[PDB]
Structure formats: structure tokens, C-alpha cells
Amino acid sequence: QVQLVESGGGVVQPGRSLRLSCAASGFTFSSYGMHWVRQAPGKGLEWVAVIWYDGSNKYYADSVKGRFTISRDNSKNTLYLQMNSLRAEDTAVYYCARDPRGATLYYYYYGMDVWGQGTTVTVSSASTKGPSVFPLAPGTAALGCLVKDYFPEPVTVSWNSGALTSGVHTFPAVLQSSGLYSLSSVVTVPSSSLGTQTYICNVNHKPSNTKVDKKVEP
Amino acid sequence: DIQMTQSPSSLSASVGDRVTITCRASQSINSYLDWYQQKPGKAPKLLIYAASSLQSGVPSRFSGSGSGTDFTLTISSLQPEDFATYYCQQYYSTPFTFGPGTKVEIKRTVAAPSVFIFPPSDEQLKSGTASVVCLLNNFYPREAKVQWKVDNALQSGNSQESVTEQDSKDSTYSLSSTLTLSKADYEKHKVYACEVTHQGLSSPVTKSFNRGE
């Protein structure tokens, strides 16, 4: 029950600032180095910052140097990341991880051996907005739903209230030049069942408190 | 700073296979290298540290070697739970840099995509915009190319693609391409065509419709 719990994520306008917290428990926090690592949507792991077990020194990735500050409080078992002058390219899931750095087991034991769960930061000017849901009308037929112009992530889509799961492909959303997201969800069904079977995509966008049920018809 | 690279970018392997992937540093980093495993929508997990030491709790089929600028990670016998993305990371010098990752995916026979094209709905059109969708369904391998033509003229800059992860059941991928036009443009044209290129096809397949038929 060693655990790192991130918090502080959310939507933030470019140029504005945000603070992440990472609560540690179940181990001796003051004997571990700590890292922030981030992962942009669809991208690999990118390293952000490190700080040593006693907050001695701190180092930063070049792309965040001068704008981010890593800190820690060992009497609160917590690690922080102060993020200022946020840019679009800063949008990611942010992870904290602990790193023994030879403090334990072996003098060469260096690595991020425990991670938090991640917290999403989204940098954007866009306003919260629920999606429009358009049908993709149909021995096998394809049908689907186009879930368009929403902000922010995410939406969830199901078919016939979760009843229909085979042949369902719900694609990763794409960010449009508008700043609004779009995704489609499709399903292949036997051509025979059209007219006999009803197909309804269920879309919900919790940040808009929007829920839409769209019948997809031939 | 030190630059990390990996190879290959992706590899296709089967359960029971001996998998070997490599990591390269832009300069010598001695043995100061970590390997990580990450699965979609979850936190990375330390596999190897100091280039060859196994992290506690990690199956012995994993191992690692190298020192200086060249490193390898080897899975002696791939198990279903090893299909993931793997990252190296140097801690020799700050800033600490990850490699781009190597995606270990599930090999299957070639499968050509099934192509469907969808006209924009009446409902969308009433609101001034037209989206035309082309679906490439249940193909393997992942490399596929979609192209749009409107009245045989070649589109560019008005489409976006999305691809699913490898399906768990059949290990195929699916691809969505969306061609976005103004309602006014959409109605100045007749034939809309999606042309698909993929290893499973002898020659490209074209799906089209005529506007209002």
C-alpha cells in the first residue's frame, strides 16, 4: 500500500498557471528522489523534473526550464509541481514517480520504481461544450455515430446502452483546428438485422452534463 | 543533453517467441539505463535498472544487457501479458531522457481492410457543415493509406485520421478518416471517393458515392 496519488489536473488557458500535488504514503518519502514525467496524447514518456530526497537540488527538462518549479515538503509527505506560463504543447497526463537513487537495496538501485496514477492537464482557450451527434447510416453492414465539436475530453460512447459490444470500434478523438474534439464510433452488424434490430448510440459528455441518444437508421 | 533512440519502432511477435529490442545513447552512459513497460491507459512499470538488474517482482523471462552506448532488452519467451510498449531511460546525466518507445504487438496473418463510406447526414447539413467518413475495418498490419477525391480532384489538408489499438480478439486494427467541407462546397460537387492502400489488397480499393443518390 505504498502509494503516490497525484491531484491538481484540469483545463487551463494558455499563459495561465497550475499546481500539481503528489501525496505519498506507505514508505519513507524523505529517503527518495522524486520525478515528474508526462505523456502527451498518443506520445511517449517525456521527463519533466527531478528533486533529490532532501530537496537539495532540482533539475528540469529544457522545454519547461524557467517555467516549472518542482518542490517538496517532507513533513507532509508531498511533492509539488508549480506550472506557470502554460502553453498548448504542455497538455498531457502528468505522473509523479519515486526513485530510490541508491538510497536502498543497492548503491546502483536507480529507477522510478513506483508511479502515481497520473492527472490530466489540458491547456486550451476553448469553452466547455457538449457534442453534436450525427448518425453514420448503414452480408455485413457498417453503421455508426459521429460525435463532433465537444470540449473537453472525454466523451464515452456505448451502443444500445452497453448491450451491443461486438464489432464496436470507438476511435481515439482528434483535436480540430477549432480547438474542439471529434470522434466517431462504428459497429458492423449483419445486414439482415437492419430494420429488425434498432441501433442507438449513447453518448455522454459529463463536463457539459450532456447526454444524447441517437438512433442510427437505414 | 544525451539523446536516446530505440529500434525497432514496432515489432510483431507471437507467444513463445524470443523478443529482442535495442536502445542507443548519443554518448556513453556506462550502465546507467532503466527499462520500462507501459500498457495503454496506465502507469509505466520498472523492469530493469543499471542496464542488467531485474526490478523486484519481475518475471525472469525478462533480461537486459549492454554498457556504454548500446543496450538490449530481451524477453526469452513472450507471454500474452508482455504485449506492450517498452521504454529505455538514461540517468547518467541531467536532463534525464527517455527513448521513444518500442511497441510490441501481436502478429497475425495479413488481413485486408473492409471499406465503407458514409455521406454527411441530413441533420449535420441543416447546420451548415459536411463531414464525410471513410471506415477501414479489421485489417492487419497497421500500415494503411486513405485518400480522398472529390470529382476526381485530389484533397489535401481537409481530412483527419484515427486508428484503434490492436483489437484483443482478432488482433486487427481499424481506421477512420473524416473529410470536412462547408455545406456550400459539398453541394457544388457530385462524386466523393475514398481510396485505400494496404498490403492485403492487390491494388487500391475505392469506395465512392454520388451526392444525393
CSV table of C-alpha atoms in Angstrom, one decimal:
chain,number,residue,atom,x,y,z
A,1,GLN,CA,0.0,0.0,0.0
A,2,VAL,CA,2.9,2.1,-1.0
A,3,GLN,CA,1.1,4.7,-3.0
A,4,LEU,CA,1.6,8.0,-4.9
A,5,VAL,CA,-1.6,10.0,-5.5
A,6,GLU,CA,-1.5,12.9,-8.0
A,7,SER,CA,-4.0,15.7,-8.0
A,8,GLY,CA,-4.4,19.2,-9.4
A,9,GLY,CA,-5.1,18.5,-13.0
A,10,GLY,CA,-7.7,20.3,-15.1
A,11,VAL,CA,-8.3,22.7,-18.0
A,12,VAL,CA,-6.3,25.9,-18.0
A,13,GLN,CA,-6.0,28.8,-20.6
A,14,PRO,CA,-2.6,29.3,-22.3
A,15,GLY,CA,-0.3,31.7,-20.3
A,16,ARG,CA,-2.0,30.9,-17.1
A,17,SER,CA,-0.6,28.7,-14.2
A,18,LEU,CA,-1.4,25.5,-12.4
A,19,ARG,CA,-0.1,23.5,-9.4
A,20,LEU,CA,0.1,19.7,-9.2
A,21,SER,CA,0.3,17.7,-5.9
A,22,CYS,CA,1.5,14.2,-5.3
A,23,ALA,CA,0.7,12.7,-1.9
A,24,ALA,CA,3.0,9.9,-0.9
A,25,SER,CA,2.2,7.2,1.7
A,26,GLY,CA,3.3,3.8,2.8
A,27,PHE,CA,7.0,4.5,2.6
A,28,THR,CA,9.7,6.8,3.9
A,29,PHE,CA,9.2,9.7,1.5
A,30,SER,CA,12.3,11.6,2.8
A,31,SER,CA,14.7,8.9,1.5
A,32,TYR,CA,13.6,9.0,-2.1
A,33,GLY,CA,14.3,11.2,-5.1
A,34,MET,CA,11.1,12.2,-7.0
A,35,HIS,CA,10.4,12.8,-10.7
A,36,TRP,CA,7.6,14.3,-12.7
A,37,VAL,CA,7.1,12.6,-16.1
A,38,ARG,CA,4.4,13.5,-18.6
A,39,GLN,CA,2.8,11.8,-21.6
A,40,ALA,CA,1.1,13.8,-24.4
A,41,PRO,CA,-1.9,12.2,-26.0
A,42,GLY,CA,-0.6,9.5,-28.3
A,43,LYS,CA,3.0,10.3,-27.5
A,44,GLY,CA,5.8,8.6,-25.4
A,45,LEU,CA,7.0,9.4,-21.9
A,46,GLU,CA,8.7,12.8,-21.6
A,47,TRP,CA,10.7,13.6,-18.4
A,48,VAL,CA,9.8,16.9,-16.7
A,49,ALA,CA,11.8,17.4,-13.5
A,50,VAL,CA,13.6,15.6,-10.6
A,51,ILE,CA,14.3,16.6,-7.0
A,52,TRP,CA,16.5,14.8,-4.5
A,53,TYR,CA,15.4,13.1,-1.3
A,54,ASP,CA,16.2,16.2,0.8
A,55,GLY,CA,15.2,18.8,-1.8
A,56,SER,CA,18.9,19.6,-2.2
A,57,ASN,CA,18.9,20.2,-5.9
A,58,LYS,CA,16.4,20.2,-8.7
A,59,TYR,CA,16.8,19.8,-12.5
A,60,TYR,CA,14.4,20.5,-15.3
A,61,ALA,CA,13.8,19.5,-18.9
A,62,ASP,CA,14.8,22.2,-21.3
A,63,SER,CA,11.3,22.7,-22.6
A,64,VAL,CA,10.0,23.6,-19.1
A,65,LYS,CA,13.1,25.2,-17.6
A,66,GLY,CA,12.2,28.7,-16.3
A,67,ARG,CA,8.5,28.0,-16.3
A,68,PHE,CA,8.1,25.0,-14.0
A,69,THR,CA,9.1,24.6,-10.3
A,70,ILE,CA,9.5,21.3,-8.6
A,71,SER,CA,9.4,21.3,-4.8
A,72,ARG,CA,8.7,19.0,-1.8
A,73,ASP,CA,7.6,19.1,1.8
A,74,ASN,CA,8.9,16.0,3.7
A,75,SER,CA,6.7,16.8,6.7
A,76,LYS,CA,3.6,16.5,4.6
A,77,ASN,CA,4.9,13.5,2.5
A,78,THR,CA,4.2,15.6,-0.6
A,79,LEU,CA,5.7,16.5,-3.9
A,80,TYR,CA,4.6,19.6,-5.9
A,81,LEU,CA,4.9,21.0,-9.4
A,82,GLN,CA,4.2,24.6,-9.9
A,83,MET,CA,3.5,25.3,-13.6
A,84,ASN,CA,3.5,28.8,-15.0
A,85,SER,CA,3.2,30.3,-18.5
A,86,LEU,CA,1.4,27.2,-19.7
A,87,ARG,CA,1.4,26.5,-23.4
A,88,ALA,CA,-0.6,24.3,-25.7
A,89,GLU,CA,2.3,21.8,-26.0
A,90,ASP,CA,2.2,21.3,-22.2
A,91,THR,CA,-1.1,19.4,-22.4
A,92,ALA,CA,-0.6,15.8,-21.0
A,93,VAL,CA,-1.1,13.3,-18.3
A,94,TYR,CA,1.4,14.1,-15.6
A,95,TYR,CA,2.9,11.4,-13.5
A,96,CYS,CA,4.9,11.6,-10.3
A,97,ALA,CA,7.3,8.7,-9.6
A,98,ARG,CA,9.7,7.9,-6.7
A,99,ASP,CA,13.3,7.0,-7.3
A,100,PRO,CA,15.5,5.4,-4.6
A,101,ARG,CA,18.7,6.5,-6.2
A,102,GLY,CA,20.9,4.1,-4.2
A,103,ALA,CA,19.2,5.0,-1.0
A,104,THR,CA,18.1,1.4,-0.7
A,105,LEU,CA,18.9,-2.2,-1.6
A,106,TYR,CA,21.9,-1.4,-3.9
A,107,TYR,CA,24.0,1.7,-4.3
A,108,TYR,CA,23.2,1.3,-8.0
A,109,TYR,CA,19.4,0.9,-7.5
A,110,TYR,CA,18.4,3.9,-9.6
A,111,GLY,CA,14.9,4.0,-11.2
A,112,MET,CA,11.3,5.0,-11.0
A,113,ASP,CA,10.0,2.0,-9.2
A,114,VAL,CA,6.7,3.4,-8.1
A,115,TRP,CA,4.4,5.7,-10.0
A,116,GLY,CA,1.2,7.7,-9.3
A,117,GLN,CA,-1.8,7.2,-11.4
A,118,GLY,CA,-1.5,10.4,-13.5
A,119,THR,CA,-3.5,13.5,-13.6
A,120,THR,CA,-4.5,15.2,-16.9
A,121,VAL,CA,-3.6,18.8,-17.7
A,122,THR,CA,-5.3,20.3,-20.7
A,123,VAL,CA,-4.0,23.7,-22.0
A,124,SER,CA,-6.7,25.4,-24.2
A,125,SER,CA,-8.8,28.6,-24.8
A,126,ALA,CA,-11.9,26.6,-25.7
A,127,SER,CA,-15.1,26.7,-23.7
A,128,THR,CA,-16.8,23.6,-22.2
A,129,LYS,CA,-19.2,22.4,-24.9
A,130,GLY,CA,-21.3,19.2,-25.4
A,131,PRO,CA,-21.1,17.2,-28.6
A,132,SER,CA,-23.4,17.1,-31.6
A,133,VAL,CA,-24.1,13.5,-32.5
A,134,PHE,CA,-24.7,12.6,-36.1
A,135,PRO,CA,-25.6,9.2,-37.5
A,136,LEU,CA,-23.4,7.2,-39.9
A,137,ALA,CA,-26.3,5.5,-41.7
A,138,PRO,CA,-25.8,1.9,-43.0
A,139,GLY,CA,-24.0,-9.7,-45.7
A,140,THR,CA,-22.5,-7.4,-43.1
A,141,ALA,CA,-23.3,-3.7,-42.8
A,142,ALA,CA,-21.4,-0.8,-41.1
A,143,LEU,CA,-23.1,1.9,-39.2
A,144,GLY,CA,-22.0,4.5,-36.6
A,145,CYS,CA,-22.1,7.8,-34.9
A,146,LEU,CA,-20.1,11.0,-35.5
A,147,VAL,CA,-19.5,12.7,-32.2
A,148,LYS,CA,-18.5,16.2,-33.0
A,149,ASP,CA,-17.4,19.6,-31.6
A,150,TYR,CA,-17.1,18.9,-27.9
A,151,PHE,CA,-14.7,20.3,-25.2
A,152,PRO,CA,-13.1,19.0,-23.1
A,153,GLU,CA,-12.2,15.3,-23.2
A,154,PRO,CA,-13.7,12.9,-22.6
A,155,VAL,CA,-16.9,11.5,-24.0
A,156,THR,CA,-18.0,8.0,-23.5
A,157,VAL,CA,-20.0,6.2,-26.2
A,158,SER,CA,-21.9,2.9,-25.9
A,159,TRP,CA,-24.3,1.1,-28.3
A,160,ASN,CA,-27.8,0.1,-27.2
A,161,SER,CA,-27.0,1.1,-23.6
A,162,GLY,CA,-24.0,-1.3,-23.4
A,163,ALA,CA,-25.9,-4.2,-24.8
A,164,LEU,CA,-24.0,-4.2,-28.1
A,165,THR,CA,-20.2,-4.7,-27.8
A,166,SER,CA,-19.0,-6.9,-30.6
A,167,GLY,CA,-17.8,-5.2,-33.7
A,168,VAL,CA,-17.8,-1.9,-31.9
A,169,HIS,CA,-14.8,0.4,-32.7
A,170,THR,CA,-14.7,3.7,-30.9
A,171,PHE,CA,-11.8,5.7,-32.3
A,172,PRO,CA,-9.4,8.0,-30.5
A,173,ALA,CA,-10.7,11.5,-30.6
A,174,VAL,CA,-8.9,14.1,-32.7
A,175,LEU,CA,-8.4,17.8,-31.9
A,176,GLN,CA,-9.7,20.0,-34.7
A,177,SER,CA,-8.2,23.3,-35.7
A,178,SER,CA,-11.2,24.8,-33.8
A,179,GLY,CA,-9.9,23.6,-30.5
A,180,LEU,CA,-12.9,21.3,-30.3
A,181,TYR,CA,-12.7,17.5,-30.3
A,182,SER,CA,-14.3,15.0,-32.6
A,183,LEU,CA,-14.6,11.2,-32.6
A,184,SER,CA,-16.6,8.6,-34.4
A,185,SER,CA,-17.9,5.2,-33.1
A,186,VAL,CA,-18.8,2.5,-35.6
A,187,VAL,CA,-20.2,-1.0,-35.5
A,188,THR,CA,-20.6,-3.8,-38.1
A,189,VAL,CA,-23.8,-5.8,-37.9
A,190,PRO,CA,-25.4,-8.5,-40.0
A,191,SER,CA,-27.1,-6.8,-42.9
A,192,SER,CA,-30.2,-8.9,-42.3
A,193,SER,CA,-30.9,-7.4,-38.8
A,194,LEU,CA,-31.3,-3.9,-40.2
A,195,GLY,CA,-34.9,-2.8,-39.8
A,196,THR,CA,-35.4,-5.7,-37.4
A,197,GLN,CA,-32.8,-4.5,-34.9
A,198,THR,CA,-32.7,-1.0,-33.6
A,199,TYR,CA,-29.3,0.7,-33.3
A,200,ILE,CA,-28.8,3.7,-30.9
A,201,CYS,CA,-25.5,5.2,-29.9
A,202,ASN,CA,-25.4,6.5,-26.4
A,203,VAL,CA,-23.0,9.4,-26.0
A,204,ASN,CA,-22.3,11.2,-22.7
A,205,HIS,CA,-20.2,14.2,-22.1
A,206,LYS,CA,-20.1,14.7,-18.3
A,207,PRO,CA,-18.3,18.1,-18.2
A,208,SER,CA,-21.3,19.5,-20.2
A,209,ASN,CA,-23.8,17.4,-18.3
A,210,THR,CA,-24.8,16.4,-21.9
A,211,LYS,CA,-26.4,13.0,-22.7
A,212,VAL,CA,-27.5,12.2,-26.2
A,213,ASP,CA,-29.2,9.1,-27.6
A,214,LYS,CA,-29.1,8.9,-31.4
A,215,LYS,CA,-31.0,6.4,-33.5
A,216,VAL,CA,-29.0,5.2,-36.5
A,217,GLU,CA,-31.3,4.2,-39.3
A,218,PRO,CA,-31.0,3.0,-42.8
B,1,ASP,CA,22.0,16.5,-23.1
B,2,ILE,CA,22.0,12.8,-24.1
B,3,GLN,CA,19.7,11.6,-26.9
B,4,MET,CA,18.1,8.2,-26.6
B,5,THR,CA,16.9,6.2,-29.6
B,6,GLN,CA,15.3,2.8,-29.8
B,7,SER,CA,14.8,0.2,-32.5
B,8,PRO,CA,12.7,-1.1,-34.0
B,9,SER,CA,9.7,1.3,-33.7
B,10,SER,CA,7.3,-1.6,-33.6
B,11,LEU,CA,7.7,-5.3,-33.8
B,12,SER,CA,5.2,-8.1,-34.4
B,13,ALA,CA,5.7,-11.2,-32.3
B,14,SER,CA,3.9,-14.3,-31.1
B,15,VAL,CA,3.6,-16.0,-27.7
B,16,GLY,CA,6.7,-18.2,-27.2
B,17,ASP,CA,8.9,-16.0,-29.4
B,18,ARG,CA,12.3,-14.7,-28.2
B,19,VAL,CA,12.0,-10.9,-28.5
B,20,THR,CA,15.0,-8.6,-28.5
B,21,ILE,CA,14.8,-4.8,-28.7
B,22,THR,CA,17.6,-2.3,-28.5
B,23,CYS,CA,18.4,1.2,-27.0
B,24,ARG,CA,21.2,3.5,-28.1
B,25,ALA,CA,22.7,6.5,-26.3
B,26,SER,CA,24.1,9.5,-28.1
B,27,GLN,CA,27.2,9.2,-25.9
B,28,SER,CA,28.5,6.7,-23.3
B,29,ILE,CA,26.1,6.3,-20.2
B,30,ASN,CA,28.1,3.4,-18.7
B,31,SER,CA,25.4,1.1,-17.2
B,32,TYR,CA,23.1,4.0,-16.2
B,33,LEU,CA,20.0,2.8,-18.0
B,34,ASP,CA,16.4,1.9,-17.0
B,35,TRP,CA,13.9,-0.2,-19.0
B,36,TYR,CA,10.1,0.4,-18.5
B,37,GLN,CA,6.9,-1.4,-19.6
B,38,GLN,CA,3.8,0.6,-20.3
B,39,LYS,CA,0.3,-0.6,-21.4
B,40,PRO,CA,-2.3,1.8,-22.8
B,41,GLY,CA,-4.1,3.9,-20.3
B,42,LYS,CA,-1.8,3.0,-17.3
B,43,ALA,CA,1.4,4.0,-15.5
B,44,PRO,CA,4.8,2.7,-16.6
B,45,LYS,CA,6.5,-0.1,-14.7
B,46,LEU,CA,10.2,-0.5,-14.0
B,47,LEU,CA,11.6,-3.7,-15.4
B,48,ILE,CA,15.3,-3.3,-15.4
B,49,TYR,CA,17.7,-0.9,-13.8
B,50,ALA,CA,21.5,-0.4,-14.1
B,51,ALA,CA,21.2,-2.0,-17.6
B,52,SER,CA,21.0,-5.6,-16.4
B,53,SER,CA,19.4,-5.7,-12.9
B,54,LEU,CA,15.9,-7.1,-12.7
B,55,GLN,CA,13.4,-5.0,-10.7
B,56,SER,CA,11.9,-6.9,-7.8
B,57,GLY,CA,8.8,-9.0,-8.7
B,58,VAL,CA,9.5,-9.1,-12.5
B,59,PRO,CA,9.4,-12.5,-14.3
B,60,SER,CA,12.8,-13.9,-15.2
B,61,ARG,CA,12.0,-14.3,-18.9
B,62,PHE,CA,13.0,-10.6,-19.0
B,63,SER,CA,16.7,-9.6,-19.1
B,64,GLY,CA,18.9,-6.8,-20.2
B,65,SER,CA,22.5,-6.2,-21.3
B,66,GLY,CA,24.9,-3.6,-22.8
B,67,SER,CA,27.0,-0.8,-21.5
B,68,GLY,CA,28.2,2.5,-22.9
B,69,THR,CA,26.0,3.5,-25.9
B,70,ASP,CA,24.2,0.2,-26.8
B,71,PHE,CA,21.7,-1.8,-24.8
B,72,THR,CA,19.2,-4.6,-25.3
B,73,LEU,CA,16.1,-5.9,-23.6
B,74,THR,CA,15.3,-9.5,-24.2
B,75,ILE,CA,12.1,-11.5,-23.5
B,76,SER,CA,13.2,-15.1,-23.7
B,77,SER,CA,9.6,-16.4,-24.2
B,78,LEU,CA,6.9,-13.8,-24.9
B,79,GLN,CA,3.8,-14.3,-22.7
B,80,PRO,CA,0.4,-12.7,-23.5
B,81,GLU,CA,0.9,-10.1,-20.8
B,82,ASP,CA,4.1,-8.7,-22.5
B,83,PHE,CA,2.4,-7.1,-25.4
B,84,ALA,CA,3.0,-3.5,-24.6
B,85,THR,CA,5.3,-0.6,-25.2
B,86,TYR,CA,8.8,-0.6,-23.8
B,87,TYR,CA,10.9,2.5,-22.9
B,88,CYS,CA,14.6,3.0,-22.1
B,89,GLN,CA,15.8,5.9,-19.9
B,90,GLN,CA,19.3,7.2,-19.1
B,91,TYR,CA,20.1,8.6,-15.7
B,92,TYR,CA,23.8,9.2,-16.3
B,93,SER,CA,23.3,13.0,-16.8
B,94,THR,CA,20.6,15.6,-16.3
B,95,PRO,CA,18.2,16.3,-18.1
B,96,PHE,CA,17.0,12.6,-17.9
B,97,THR,CA,15.8,11.4,-21.2
B,98,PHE,CA,13.5,8.6,-22.4
B,99,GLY,CA,13.8,6.7,-25.7
B,100,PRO,CA,10.7,7.0,-28.0
B,101,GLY,CA,9.5,3.5,-27.0
B,102,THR,CA,9.1,0.2,-28.9
B,103,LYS,CA,5.6,-1.1,-29.4
B,104,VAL,CA,5.5,-4.9,-29.1
B,105,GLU,CA,2.4,-6.0,-30.9
B,106,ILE,CA,0.6,-9.3,-31.8
B,107,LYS,CA,1.5,-10.9,-35.1
B,108,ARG,CA,-1.3,-12.3,-37.3
B,109,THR,CA,-1.9,-13.1,-40.9
B,110,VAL,CA,-2.3,-10.2,-43.4
B,111,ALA,CA,-6.0,-9.1,-43.4
B,112,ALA,CA,-7.2,-6.6,-45.9
B,113,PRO,CA,-9.5,-3.8,-44.6
B,114,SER,CA,-13.2,-3.6,-45.4
B,115,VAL,CA,-14.0,-0.2,-46.8
B,116,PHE,CA,-17.2,1.8,-46.1
B,117,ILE,CA,-18.0,5.4,-47.0
B,118,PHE,CA,-20.7,7.5,-45.3
B,119,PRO,CA,-22.3,10.6,-46.7
B,120,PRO,CA,-22.9,13.5,-44.3
B,121,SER,CA,-26.3,13.2,-42.5
B,122,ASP,CA,-29.3,15.3,-43.3
B,123,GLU,CA,-29.1,16.6,-39.8
B,124,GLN,CA,-25.5,17.8,-40.0
B,125,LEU,CA,-26.2,19.5,-43.3
B,126,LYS,CA,-29.0,21.6,-41.8
B,127,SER,CA,-26.3,23.2,-39.6
B,128,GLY,CA,-24.0,24.3,-42.4
B,129,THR,CA,-21.2,21.7,-42.4
B,130,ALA,CA,-20.4,18.5,-44.2
B,131,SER,CA,-18.4,15.5,-42.8
B,132,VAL,CA,-17.7,12.5,-45.0
B,133,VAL,CA,-16.4,9.4,-43.2
B,134,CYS,CA,-14.4,6.5,-44.6
B,135,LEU,CA,-14.0,3.4,-42.4
B,136,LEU,CA,-11.2,0.9,-42.9
B,137,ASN,CA,-12.3,-2.0,-40.8
B,138,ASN,CA,-10.5,-5.0,-39.2
B,139,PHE,CA,-7.2,-5.1,-41.2
B,140,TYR,CA,-3.7,-6.2,-40.4
B,141,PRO,CA,-0.9,-5.0,-40.4
B,142,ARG,CA,-1.4,-1.4,-39.1
B,143,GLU,CA,0.0,0.4,-42.1
B,144,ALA,CA,-2.8,1.7,-44.3
B,145,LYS,CA,-3.3,4.7,-46.5
B,146,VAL,CA,-6.5,6.6,-47.2
B,147,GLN,CA,-7.0,9.1,-49.9
B,148,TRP,CA,-9.8,11.4,-50.7
B,149,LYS,CA,-11.0,12.5,-54.2
B,150,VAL,CA,-13.9,14.8,-54.9
B,151,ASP,CA,-15.0,14.7,-58.6
B,152,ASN,CA,-11.6,13.0,-59.1
B,153,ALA,CA,-9.7,16.0,-57.7
B,154,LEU,CA,-7.2,15.2,-55.0
B,155,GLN,CA,-7.9,16.5,-51.5
B,156,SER,CA,-5.3,17.7,-49.1
B,157,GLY,CA,-5.5,19.4,-45.6
B,158,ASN,CA,-9.2,18.8,-45.1
B,159,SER,CA,-9.0,15.3,-43.6
B,160,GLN,CA,-8.1,13.7,-40.2
B,161,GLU,CA,-7.4,10.1,-39.4
B,162,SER,CA,-7.8,8.0,-36.3
B,163,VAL,CA,-6.7,4.4,-35.6
B,164,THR,CA,-7.8,1.9,-33.0
B,165,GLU,CA,-5.4,-0.1,-30.8
B,166,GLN,CA,-4.9,-3.7,-31.7
B,167,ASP,CA,-8.2,-5.5,-31.1
B,168,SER,CA,-7.9,-8.1,-28.3
B,169,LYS,CA,-9.9,-10.8,-30.1
B,170,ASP,CA,-8.7,-10.9,-33.6
B,171,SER,CA,-5.7,-8.6,-33.3
B,172,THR,CA,-6.8,-6.4,-36.2
B,173,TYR,CA,-6.8,-2.5,-36.4
B,174,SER,CA,-9.4,-0.1,-37.6
B,175,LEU,CA,-9.1,3.3,-39.2
B,176,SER,CA,-11.4,6.3,-39.5
B,177,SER,CA,-10.8,9.1,-42.0
B,178,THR,CA,-13.1,12.2,-41.9
B,179,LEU,CA,-13.3,14.7,-44.9
B,180,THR,CA,-14.6,18.0,-43.6
B,181,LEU,CA,-16.2,20.6,-46.0
B,182,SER,CA,-18.5,23.6,-45.9
B,183,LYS,CA,-22.1,22.6,-46.8
B,184,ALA,CA,-21.8,25.0,-49.8
B,185,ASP,CA,-18.7,23.3,-51.1
B,186,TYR,CA,-20.2,19.8,-50.5
B,187,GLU,CA,-23.1,20.7,-52.7
B,188,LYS,CA,-21.0,22.0,-55.6
B,189,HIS,CA,-19.7,18.5,-56.2
B,190,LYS,CA,-21.0,15.1,-57.2
B,191,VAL,CA,-18.6,12.1,-56.7
B,192,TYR,CA,-16.9,11.6,-53.3
B,193,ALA,CA,-14.4,8.8,-53.2
B,194,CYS,CA,-12.2,7.2,-50.5
B,195,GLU,CA,-9.2,5.3,-52.0
B,196,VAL,CA,-7.4,2.8,-49.7
B,197,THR,CA,-3.9,1.4,-50.0
B,198,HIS,CA,-2.9,-1.6,-47.9
B,199,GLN,CA,-0.7,-4.7,-48.1
B,200,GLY,CA,-3.7,-7.0,-48.1
B,201,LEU,CA,-5.0,-5.6,-51.4
B,202,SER,CA,-3.7,-6.4,-54.9
B,203,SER,CA,-4.4,-2.8,-55.9
B,204,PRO,CA,-6.0,0.1,-54.2
B,205,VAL,CA,-9.7,-0.1,-53.4
B,206,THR,CA,-12.0,2.8,-54.0
B,207,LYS,CA,-15.3,3.4,-52.2
B,208,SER,CA,-17.5,6.3,-53.6
B,209,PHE,CA,-20.9,7.7,-53.6
B,210,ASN,CA,-22.7,10.3,-55.8
B,211,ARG,CA,-24.2,13.2,-53.7
B,212,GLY,CA,-28.0,12.7,-53.5
B,213,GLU,CA,-28.3,9.2,-54.8
